[PDB]
Amino acid sequence: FSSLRKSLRSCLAHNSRWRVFVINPLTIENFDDDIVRFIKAFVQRYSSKYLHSNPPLFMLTGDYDLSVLQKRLYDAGLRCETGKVGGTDVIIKELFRRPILIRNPFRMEFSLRLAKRDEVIGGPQRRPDELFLINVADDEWKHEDVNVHGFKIERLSDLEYILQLRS
Amino acid sequence: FSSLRKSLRSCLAHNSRWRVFVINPLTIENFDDDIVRFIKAFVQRYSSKYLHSNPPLFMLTGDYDLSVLQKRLYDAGLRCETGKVGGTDVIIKELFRRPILIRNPFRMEFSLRLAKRDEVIGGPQRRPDELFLINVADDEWKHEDVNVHGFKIERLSDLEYILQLRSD
Amino acid sequence: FSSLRKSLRSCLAHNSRWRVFVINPLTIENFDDDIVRFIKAFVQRYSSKYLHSNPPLFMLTGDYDLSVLQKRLYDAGLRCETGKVGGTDVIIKELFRRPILIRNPFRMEFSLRLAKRDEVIGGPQRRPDELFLINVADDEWKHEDVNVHGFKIERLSDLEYILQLRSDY
Amino acid sequence: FSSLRKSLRSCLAHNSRWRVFVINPLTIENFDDDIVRFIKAFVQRYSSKYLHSNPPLFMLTGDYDLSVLQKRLYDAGLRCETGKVGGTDVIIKELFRRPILIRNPFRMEFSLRLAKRDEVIGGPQRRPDELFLINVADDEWKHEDVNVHGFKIERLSDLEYILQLRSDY
Amino acid sequence: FSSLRKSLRSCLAHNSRWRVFVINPLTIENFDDDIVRFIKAFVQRYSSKYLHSNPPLFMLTGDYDLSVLQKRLYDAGLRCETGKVGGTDVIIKELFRRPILIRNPFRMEFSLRLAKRDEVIGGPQRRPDELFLINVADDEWKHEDVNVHGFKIERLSDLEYILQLRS
Amino acid sequence: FSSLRKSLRSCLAHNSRWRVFVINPLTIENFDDDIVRFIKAFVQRYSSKYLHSNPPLFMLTGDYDLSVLQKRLYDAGLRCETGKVGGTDVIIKELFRRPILIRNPFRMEFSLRLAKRDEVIGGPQRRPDELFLINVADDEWKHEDVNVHGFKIERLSDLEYILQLRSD
């Protein structure tokens, strides 16, 4: 793990970058208790300034309930982009889009983009720079010109260390 | 205790945050003599600038006299908020309120919040970011989305090391 | 390998300099898969500012297809100078030329050069400062007054360490 | 003594604070020779700029003669406050008072305060933040909400190390 | 050699100084191949800015031919001063003169001075601050109030390390 | 030799201070050859700025000859303040006086005071801050309130190392 941690320092230095996460809930212990704090910690470090142009993408696989998490995050303070335009289906162009920004006083439209994998039918216009996989084997968005980082963990507190959120 | 000192460097980096403390004095040695100088150092470090917007909350548990400590702190040079309009009852909305700040010259309305637990019945609109429990086991404000640091100590100088007030 | 990395710290500090690379792909593992990312990282570290005034040259010996790699680089978001005007032939004066630069907002006409070695017959008027040779023994552009660094590698990732792109080995 | 040195790192970081020293000279060797240099160094390091609002106080217990020390300090180039108006008696509000200051060009009214403990009867408006005691057992100004630092030394060269005036022992 | 490197840190700290070199090529291996690069790097380090007022002097003893070296250095990009007006013999006041400088945009008249010791007759107006001798025993410019640096080398890769050109 | 170097680190930091040197050359090896270079280095480090406003004094003890060294220093590019008006006897007020200084462009009237001990009959109005003694036991300018550093050396480079002019 300490071998992996410093490998990632170059990836996470850039201010403007496109990052995807794919996660599987079942094989992580105490997931529903720590996910919210995990996201709240990532955002403040990596998505709290003007130069941080693009928010990150979180994809959860399996049969899971997004509404509850979205409400809990709204109570915590954060706003999310899901991609729906009123119905039960997801739209790619609305999911991937640029937010409004105001330099002074600082205002932001949304800080993260959330979804499920099964619903996202298709691919983006611009391939991702970094694809992170946590306990998933392979995904359709793998390519030779894209950097794939793949891990296996037993608790979420382990990943924060890798990503430099704690000591 | 050494690793925990390094464990908390990230939490105390942010300037503006809502921090809560709970203390039980019966099981701490030499409390009455050292509490004032603990509070004074914490305030002079983490709540003595303009960007430091939310003052901290100190909750004491047990049967205890706040008035004497409040007078001692006034003599030392600090001003406190207690949430009391004449009467014994504690108005919650008047204890979770923002103070007046002036950049030049620097002046503040109050520097700390002080209360008793049993007197404070209810809850806040915004949940606390960090909840420190010193010598206490359970509380009503614990939740999944709040960070909780529970400790057990025999003296205050031990806590000074953890919170970076002192070199040793 | 570790001392080689530090032997080069002084060469690569300067902002403006003329750098040439020669490569043989027949004897490298996973070349087709790692090449684009090699180029992208090098460019991002040494070709993304106003002070950086000379883009680099990459020459590939053998029988190889440049067009596909060019399309892939375009998809990745980078532009290349090849030195051709319609036809098959290559022009030295149109491959060794200065690019347009706009300071605010930053724009650059092109970020790298490309070619095949056999097609490029001739030479430049100003001789290269640094001529990296990766797995090739001898060339026609070597001289007493040019700095020459020859290496032997088995996979591309080692050069990342040698040249400070990724610290971990 | 290496243990005590870094304990005082935070206390001496601030620019504006109120410090008090109590000393006993009967049990220190070669006192009259080095007292003046001690004061001069302390003053140069902690009392020589605009942001240093409060000058420090030196109290001596015993049967000492202050006139000679005052004359020697004037020859060395320093001005002191003693807290007297013609007479023998000592006044408190003159001794604990703020001085004139001019930022540009920098000038100060007085740089230190001196006295004998017995003549000074009473207390101040504001209790002191730091009370150093050197070879002295008990004082009336000791209080729970005041920081007290008690030491035992055979020479004055050691206290300079403790207080971070000179490099090493 | 690890001893000498840091000994010279103080001499090479100042920006404006008068530095002299004396060299013997007979007992150095692979000399003609590496001289030009040595001069190039020294110049790039110590004679590229407005504060570097006085360029340095290189003297060669023996039966060497200077014309070829001057041509190679011209091709490399450096203009040299040789102290001759007409061609037969040397003139000291032309050799030891001050150049033109423009602060913005930077242009300089010449970067280095070059000569043969047998041809140079006499002494300067101001004595040298630092005199370097490489495989030479005695010289007439040795005085008590002048710093001397006598060395022995079998290659020129060593002197670069001594002078902090490479590590 | 090493810790002694660190003892003097605090003394040499101040920009403006009055400094005196007393030297005996009979017992030093290779004095004439190295004195000038010692002086030149000391001046370049400690007496070549605007804020450096109190040039140092050197006093040489014995039957030495100043004129030659003074000429050597003029050749090397430095000016000195001897203190004579008529080349017979020294005057204190003329040897202990302030120099002219122009900030832009930088120019200085003189950079050092040079003298012999026997000729300087008297004392200054302001006592020296730092008195360095090299191979002399006792002096008439020693006092309780004046710092005295006394050494014994065999070559000048040792003192150079002590005073931080050369690494080693």
mmCIF file of all heavy atoms in Angstrom, chain E residues 52-86:
data_model
loop_
_atom_site.group_PDB
_atom_site.id
_atom_site.type_symbol
_atom_site.label_atom_id
_atom_site.label_comp_id
_atom_site.label_asym_id
_atom_site.label_seq_id
_atom_site.Cartn_x
_atom_site.Cartn_y
_atom_site.Cartn_z
ATOM 1 N N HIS E 52 27.189 39.538 -15.055
ATOM 2 C CA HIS E 52 28.475 38.904 -15.323
ATOM 3 C C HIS E 52 29.266 39.807 -16.255
ATOM 4 O O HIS E 52 29.205 39.684 -17.476
ATOM 5 C CB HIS E 52 28.264 37.522 -15.912
ATOM 6 C CG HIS E 52 27.415 36.633 -15.062
ATOM 7 N ND1 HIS E 52 26.955 35.409 -15.492
ATOM 8 C CD2 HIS E 52 26.955 36.784 -13.800
ATOM 9 C CE1 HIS E 52 26.239 34.850 -14.536
ATOM 10 N NE2 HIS E 52 26.224 35.662 -13.497
ATOM 11 N N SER E 53 30.035 40.716 -15.661
ATOM 12 C CA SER E 53 30.607 41.830 -16.403
ATOM 13 C C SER E 53 31.832 41.422 -17.208
ATOM 14 O O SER E 53 31.889 41.659 -18.418
ATOM 15 C CB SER E 53 30.962 42.957 -15.443
ATOM 16 O OG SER E 53 29.814 43.418 -14.753
ATOM 17 N N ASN E 54 32.826 40.827 -16.555
ATOM 18 C CA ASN E 54 34.109 40.575 -17.181
ATOM 19 C C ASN E 54 34.204 39.134 -17.636
ATOM 20 O O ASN E 54 34.139 38.225 -16.797
ATOM 21 C CB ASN E 54 35.236 40.883 -16.220
ATOM 22 C CG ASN E 54 36.378 41.600 -16.882
ATOM 23 O OD1 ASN E 54 36.612 41.447 -18.077
ATOM 24 N ND2 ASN E 54 37.112 42.373 -16.107
ATOM 25 N N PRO E 55 34.343 38.875 -18.928
ATOM 26 C CA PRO E 55 34.476 37.518 -19.399
ATOM 27 C C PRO E 55 35.835 36.938 -19.059
ATOM 28 O O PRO E 55 36.786 37.676 -18.763
ATOM 29 C CB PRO E 55 34.294 37.659 -20.907
ATOM 30 C CG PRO E 55 33.540 38.821 -21.055
ATOM 31 C CD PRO E 55 34.004 39.764 -20.040
ATOM 32 N N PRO E 56 35.962 35.620 -19.090
ATOM 33 C CA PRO E 56 37.178 34.956 -18.636
ATOM 34 C C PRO E 56 38.209 34.747 -19.735
ATOM 35 O O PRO E 56 37.924 34.882 -20.933
ATOM 36 C CB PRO E 56 36.636 33.623 -18.146
ATOM 37 C CG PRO E 56 35.527 33.389 -18.988
ATOM 38 C CD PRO E 56 34.873 34.658 -19.230
ATOM 39 N N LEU E 57 39.419 34.390 -19.301
ATOM 40 C CA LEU E 57 40.548 34.273 -20.206
ATOM 41 C C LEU E 57 41.134 32.873 -20.185
ATOM 42 O O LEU E 57 41.416 32.325 -19.113
ATOM 43 C CB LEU E 57 41.616 35.293 -19.872
ATOM 44 C CG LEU E 57 42.735 35.387 -20.882
ATOM 45 C CD1 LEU E 57 42.308 36.038 -22.148
ATOM 46 C CD2 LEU E 57 43.787 36.192 -20.303
ATOM 47 N N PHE E 58 41.313 32.306 -21.374
ATOM 48 C CA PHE E 58 41.887 30.983 -21.559
ATOM 49 C C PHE E 58 43.215 31.113 -22.292
ATOM 50 O O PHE E 58 43.263 31.661 -23.405
ATOM 51 C CB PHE E 58 40.937 30.088 -22.346
ATOM 52 C CG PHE E 58 39.738 29.630 -21.582
ATOM 53 C CD1 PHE E 58 38.563 30.332 -21.626
ATOM 54 C CD2 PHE E 58 39.778 28.485 -20.843
ATOM 55 C CE1 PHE E 58 37.468 29.908 -20.937
ATOM 56 C CE2 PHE E 58 38.681 28.067 -20.154
ATOM 57 C CZ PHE E 58 37.528 28.784 -20.207
ATOM 58 N N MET E 59 44.282 30.594 -21.688
ATOM 59 C CA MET E 59 45.602 30.593 -22.288
ATOM 60 C C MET E 59 46.071 29.167 -22.510
ATOM 61 O O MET E 59 45.967 28.315 -21.611
ATOM 62 C CB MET E 59 46.628 31.321 -21.427
ATOM 63 C CG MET E 59 46.735 32.804 -21.662
ATOM 64 S SD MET E 59 45.589 33.740 -20.686
ATOM 65 C CE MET E 59 46.536 33.807 -19.177
ATOM 66 N N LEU E 60 46.608 28.923 -23.697
ATOM 67 C CA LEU E 60 47.142 27.621 -24.055
ATOM 68 C C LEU E 60 48.625 27.720 -24.365
ATOM 69 O O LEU E 60 49.054 28.617 -25.095
ATOM 70 C CB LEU E 60 46.401 27.021 -25.234
ATOM 71 C CG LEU E 60 44.983 26.596 -24.913
ATOM 72 C CD1 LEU E 60 44.191 26.505 -26.157
ATOM 73 C CD2 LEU E 60 44.984 25.275 -24.184
ATOM 74 N N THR E 61 49.398 26.793 -23.810
ATOM 75 C CA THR E 61 50.834 26.712 -24.004
ATOM 76 C C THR E 61 51.182 25.500 -24.851
ATOM 77 O O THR E 61 50.607 24.422 -24.676
ATOM 78 C CB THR E 61 51.562 26.612 -22.675
ATOM 79 O OG1 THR E 61 51.204 25.393 -22.025
ATOM 80 C CG2 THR E 61 51.204 27.770 -21.780
ATOM 81 N N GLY E 62 52.132 25.680 -25.756
ATOM 82 C CA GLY E 62 52.516 24.640 -26.681
ATOM 83 C C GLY E 62 52.591 25.124 -28.112
ATOM 84 O O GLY E 62 52.908 26.289 -28.361
ATOM 85 N N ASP E 63 52.309 24.237 -29.064
ATOM 86 C CA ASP E 63 52.315 24.564 -30.482
ATOM 87 C C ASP E 63 50.927 24.413 -31.097
ATOM 88 O O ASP E 63 50.790 24.019 -32.256
ATOM 89 C CB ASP E 63 53.324 23.696 -31.223
ATOM 90 C CG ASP E 63 53.132 22.220 -30.948
ATOM 91 O OD1 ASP E 63 52.265 21.881 -30.114
ATOM 92 O OD2 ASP E 63 53.846 21.399 -31.561
ATOM 93 N N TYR E 64 49.891 24.728 -30.329
ATOM 94 C CA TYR E 64 48.519 24.532 -30.757
ATOM 95 C C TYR E 64 48.141 25.526 -31.849
ATOM 96 O O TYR E 64 48.787 26.560 -32.038
ATOM 97 C CB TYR E 64 47.593 24.672 -29.558
ATOM 98 C CG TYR E 64 46.296 23.933 -29.661
ATOM 99 C CD1 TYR E 64 46.231 22.586 -29.409
ATOM 100 C CD2 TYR E 64 45.132 24.590 -29.997
ATOM 101 C CE1 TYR E 64 45.046 21.907 -29.496
ATOM 102 C CE2 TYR E 64 43.945 23.921 -30.086
ATOM 103 C CZ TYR E 64 43.905 22.583 -29.834
ATOM 104 O OH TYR E 64 42.711 21.911 -29.925
ATOM 105 N N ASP E 65 47.081 25.194 -32.581
ATOM 106 C CA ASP E 65 46.535 26.034 -33.642
ATOM 107 C C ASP E 65 45.175 26.563 -33.213
ATOM 108 O O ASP E 65 44.255 25.783 -32.954
ATOM 109 C CB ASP E 65 46.422 25.256 -34.947
ATOM 110 C CG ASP E 65 46.257 26.155 -36.150
ATOM 111 O OD1 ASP E 65 46.555 27.362 -36.040
ATOM 112 O OD2 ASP E 65 45.832 25.653 -37.211
ATOM 113 N N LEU E 66 45.054 27.884 -33.142
ATOM 114 C CA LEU E 66 43.869 28.528 -32.602
ATOM 115 C C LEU E 66 42.765 28.736 -33.623
ATOM 116 O O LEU E 66 41.589 28.822 -33.243
ATOM 117 C CB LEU E 66 44.241 29.879 -32.005
ATOM 118 C CG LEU E 66 45.123 29.911 -30.782
ATOM 119 C CD1 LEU E 66 45.588 31.323 -30.554
ATOM 120 C CD2 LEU E 66 44.338 29.429 -29.615
ATOM 121 N N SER E 67 43.121 28.876 -34.895
ATOM 122 C CA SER E 67 42.144 29.224 -35.914
ATOM 123 C C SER E 67 41.014 28.206 -35.973
ATOM 124 O O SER E 67 39.830 28.568 -36.032
ATOM 125 C CB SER E 67 42.843 29.327 -37.259
ATOM 126 O OG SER E 67 43.555 28.142 -37.540
ATOM 127 N N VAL E 68 41.364 26.924 -35.986
ATOM 128 C CA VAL E 68 40.360 25.878 -36.088
ATOM 129 C C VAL E 68 39.417 25.932 -34.902
ATOM 130 O O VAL E 68 38.195 25.790 -35.048
ATOM 131 C CB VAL E 68 41.035 24.504 -36.188
ATOM 132 C CG1 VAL E 68 40.002 23.428 -36.437
ATOM 133 C CG2 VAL E 68 42.061 24.489 -37.259
ATOM 134 N N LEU E 69 39.966 26.121 -33.707
ATOM 135 C CA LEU E 69 39.132 26.196 -32.521
ATOM 136 C C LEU E 69 38.181 27.378 -32.610
ATOM 137 O O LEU E 69 37.003 27.267 -32.254
ATOM 138 C CB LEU E 69 40.012 26.287 -31.285
ATOM 139 C CG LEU E 69 39.401 26.203 -29.905
ATOM 140 C CD1 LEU E 69 38.832 24.859 -29.677
ATOM 141 C CD2 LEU E 69 40.452 26.451 -28.901
ATOM 142 N N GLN E 70 38.667 28.516 -33.102
ATOM 143 C CA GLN E 70 37.798 29.676 -33.225
ATOM 144 C C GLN E 70 36.667 29.408 -34.204
ATOM 145 O O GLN E 70 35.524 29.816 -33.973
ATOM 146 C CB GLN E 70 38.592 30.896 -33.659
ATOM 147 C CG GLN E 70 39.583 31.379 -32.663
ATOM 148 C CD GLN E 70 40.226 32.677 -33.083
ATOM 149 O OE1 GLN E 70 39.844 33.275 -34.085
ATOM 150 N NE2 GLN E 70 41.221 33.116 -32.323
ATOM 151 N N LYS E 71 36.961 28.714 -35.296
ATOM 152 C CA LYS E 71 35.919 28.398 -36.265
ATOM 153 C C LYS E 71 34.876 27.457 -35.682
ATOM 154 O O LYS E 71 33.669 27.657 -35.875
ATOM 155 C CB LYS E 71 36.538 27.783 -37.502
ATOM 156 C CG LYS E 71 35.578 27.634 -38.642
ATOM 157 C CD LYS E 71 35.563 28.861 -39.506
ATOM 158 C CE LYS E 71 34.213 29.068 -40.131
ATOM 159 N NZ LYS E 71 33.925 28.036 -41.139
ATOM 160 N N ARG E 72 35.319 26.416 -34.983
ATOM 161 C CA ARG E 72 34.379 25.501 -34.351
ATOM 162 C C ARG E 72 33.511 26.223 -33.337
ATOM 163 O O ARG E 72 32.305 25.971 -33.247
ATOM 164 C CB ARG E 72 35.133 24.352 -33.699
ATOM 165 C CG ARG E 72 35.987 23.582 -34.650
ATOM 166 C CD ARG E 72 36.845 22.534 -33.979
ATOM 167 N NE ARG E 72 36.084 21.613 -33.159
ATOM 168 C CZ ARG E 72 36.626 20.837 -32.233
ATOM 169 N NH1 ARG E 72 37.924 20.861 -32.035
ATOM 170 N NH2 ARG E 72 35.873 20.028 -31.516
ATOM 171 N N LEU E 73 34.098 27.139 -32.581
ATOM 172 C CA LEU E 73 33.327 27.865 -31.589
ATOM 173 C C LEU E 73 32.351 28.832 -32.243
ATOM 174 O O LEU E 73 31.255 29.051 -31.719
ATOM 175 C CB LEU E 73 34.275 28.568 -30.630
ATOM 176 C CG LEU E 73 34.754 27.761 -29.431
ATOM 177 C CD1 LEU E 73 35.625 26.617 -29.837
ATOM 178 C CD2 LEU E 73 35.534 28.627 -28.543
ATOM 179 N N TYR E 74 32.712 29.403 -33.389
ATOM 180 C CA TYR E 74 31.763 30.222 -34.133
ATOM 181 C C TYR E 74 30.577 29.394 -34.585
ATOM 182 O O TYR E 74 29.421 29.794 -34.416
ATOM 183 C CB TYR E 74 32.440 30.850 -35.338
ATOM 184 C CG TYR E 74 31.498 31.578 -36.247
ATOM 185 C CD1 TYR E 74 31.004 32.810 -35.908
ATOM 186 C CD2 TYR E 74 31.117 31.036 -37.450
ATOM 187 C CE1 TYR E 74 30.156 33.475 -36.724
ATOM 188 C CE2 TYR E 74 30.259 31.701 -38.277
ATOM 189 C CZ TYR E 74 29.782 32.917 -37.910
ATOM 190 O OH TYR E 74 28.925 33.569 -38.749
ATOM 191 N N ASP E 75 30.847 28.231 -35.171
ATOM 192 C CA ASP E 75 29.764 27.345 -35.574
ATOM 193 C C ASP E 75 28.884 26.971 -34.389
ATOM 194 O O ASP E 75 27.659 26.900 -34.514
ATOM 195 C CB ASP E 75 30.332 26.093 -36.220
ATOM 196 C CG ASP E 75 30.827 26.334 -37.617
ATOM 197 O OD1 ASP E 75 30.931 27.512 -38.016
ATOM 198 O OD2 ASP E 75 31.124 25.349 -38.320
ATOM 199 N N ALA E 76 29.490 26.731 -33.232
ATOM 200 C CA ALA E 76 28.709 26.423 -32.044
ATOM 201 C C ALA E 76 27.893 27.615 -31.577
ATOM 202 O O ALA E 76 26.853 27.433 -30.938
ATOM 203 C CB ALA E 76 29.619 25.943 -30.926
ATOM 204 N N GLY E 77 28.351 28.831 -31.855
ATOM 205 C CA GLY E 77 27.555 30.007 -31.574
ATOM 206 C C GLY E 77 28.194 31.099 -30.747
ATOM 207 O O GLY E 77 27.525 32.078 -30.411
ATOM 208 N N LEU E 78 29.470 30.967 -30.419
ATOM 209 C CA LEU E 78 30.148 31.902 -29.541
ATOM 210 C C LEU E 78 31.173 32.720 -30.305
ATOM 211 O O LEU E 78 31.912 32.192 -31.140
ATOM 212 C CB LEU E 78 30.825 31.174 -28.393
ATOM 213 C CG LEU E 78 29.900 30.406 -27.470
ATOM 214 C CD1 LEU E 78 30.575 29.191 -26.996
ATOM 215 C CD2 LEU E 78 29.459 31.247 -26.301
ATOM 216 N N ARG E 79 31.209 34.010 -30.009
ATOM 217 C CA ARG E 79 32.167 34.937 -30.580
ATOM 218 C C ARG E 79 33.275 35.215 -29.576
ATOM 219 O O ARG E 79 33.001 35.477 -28.403
ATOM 220 C CB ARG E 79 31.486 36.235 -30.990
ATOM 221 C CG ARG E 79 30.537 36.103 -32.149
ATOM 222 C CD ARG E 79 30.012 37.454 -32.571
ATOM 223 N NE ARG E 79 29.071 37.378 -33.674
ATOM 224 C CZ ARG E 79 27.768 37.175 -33.540
ATOM 225 N NH1 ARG E 79 27.229 37.015 -32.339
ATOM 226 N NH2 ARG E 79 26.999 37.125 -34.617
ATOM 227 N N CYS E 80 34.516 35.154 -30.040
ATOM 228 C CA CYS E 80 35.685 35.206 -29.183
ATOM 229 C C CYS E 80 36.486 36.467 -29.435
ATOM 230 O O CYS E 80 36.374 37.105 -30.484
ATOM 231 C CB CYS E 80 36.579 33.995 -29.422
ATOM 232 S SG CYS E 80 37.323 33.936 -31.053
ATOM 233 N N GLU E 81 37.298 36.829 -28.450
ATOM 234 C CA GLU E 81 38.215 37.948 -28.576
ATOM 235 C C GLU E 81 39.647 37.443 -28.475
ATOM 236 O O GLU E 81 39.990 36.690 -27.550
ATOM 237 C CB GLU E 81 37.930 39.002 -27.529
ATOM 238 C CG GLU E 81 38.943 40.079 -27.445
ATOM 239 C CD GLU E 81 38.995 40.949 -28.684
ATOM 240 O OE1 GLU E 81 38.275 40.655 -29.661
ATOM 241 O OE2 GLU E 81 39.763 41.934 -28.683
ATOM 242 N N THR E 82 40.476 37.879 -29.418
ATOM 243 C CA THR E 82 41.818 37.361 -29.598
ATOM 244 C C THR E 82 42.903 38.415 -29.472
ATOM 245 O O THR E 82 44.074 38.054 -29.322
ATOM 246 C CB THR E 82 41.932 36.698 -30.972
ATOM 247 O OG1 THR E 82 40.907 35.710 -31.108
ATOM 248 C CG2 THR E 82 43.283 36.041 -31.138
ATOM 249 N N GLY E 83 42.558 39.688 -29.520
ATOM 250 C CA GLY E 83 43.508 40.754 -29.326
ATOM 251 C C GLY E 83 44.522 40.940 -30.421
ATOM 252 O O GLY E 83 45.722 41.002 -30.153
ATOM 253 N N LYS E 84 44.060 41.041 -31.655
ATOM 254 C CA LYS E 84 44.932 41.345 -32.771
ATOM 255 C C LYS E 84 44.219 42.240 -33.761
ATOM 256 O O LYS E 84 43.040 42.045 -34.059
ATOM 257 C CB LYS E 84 45.435 40.080 -33.451
ATOM 258 C CG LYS E 84 44.390 39.175 -33.978
ATOM 259 C CD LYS E 84 45.045 38.050 -34.750
ATOM 260 C CE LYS E 84 45.908 37.188 -33.845
ATOM 261 N NZ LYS E 84 46.386 35.959 -34.515
ATOM 262 N N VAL E 85 44.953 43.226 -34.261
ATOM 263 C CA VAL E 85 44.434 44.205 -35.207
ATOM 264 C C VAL E 85 45.405 44.227 -36.380
ATOM 265 O O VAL E 85 46.362 45.007 -36.402
ATOM 266 C CB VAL E 85 44.290 45.593 -34.586
ATOM 267 C CG1 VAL E 85 43.858 46.589 -35.619
ATOM 268 C CG2 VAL E 85 43.319 45.545 -33.443
ATOM 269 N N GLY E 86 45.157 43.380 -37.366
ATOM 270 C CA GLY E 86 46.023 43.266 -38.518
ATOM 271 C C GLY E 86 46.501 41.854 -38.755
ATOM 272 O O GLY E 86 46.451 41.366 -39.886
#
